[PDB]
């Protein structure tokens, strides 16, 4: 019987559950960031 | 004005300030953002319900000229 991995060396880097939480967390919480910035000065424009 | 922060004894200390400066616009930017994201704190509270005191009877003088003058 053969054990094929197929796994594109993803087991070599270290905690690589809370390392995919922190590339989310970082890509979410920037998308957010620039949506709310990108509101906030639409609205001060509108309001100016 | 001044930008406080609230202490952990409800104490409220300036760490920074709001400085707007425009010409020709429609309208304060600042007040909009604040109305829109914080909450206007009432100085004034009312109550549950207005507590009558009393209705009462007072007259206009038949001259000015009292209070004119004085």
Redesign the interface.
């Known amino acids: 019987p053969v054990m094929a991995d197929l796994n594109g060396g993803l087991q070599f880097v270290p905690e690589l559950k809370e390392f995919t939480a922190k590339l989310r967390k970082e890509l979410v919480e920037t998308s957010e960031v620039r949506k709310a910035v990108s509101i906030?000065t639409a609205?001060?424009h509108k309001?100016? | 004005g001044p930008i406080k922060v609230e202490l952990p004894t409800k104490e409220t200390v300036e760490i920074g300030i709001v400085d707007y400066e425009?010409g020709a616009?429609?309208?304060?930017?600042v007040v909009?953002?604040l109305k829109?994201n914080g909450s206007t704190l009432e100085q004034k509270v009312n109550l549950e319900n207005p507590i009558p005191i009393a209705v009462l009877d007072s007259y206009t003088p038949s001259t000015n000229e009292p209070y004119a003058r004085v």
Do not use: T
């Open positions: 906030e609205l001060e309001v100016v | 425009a616009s429609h309208g304060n930017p909009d953002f829109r």
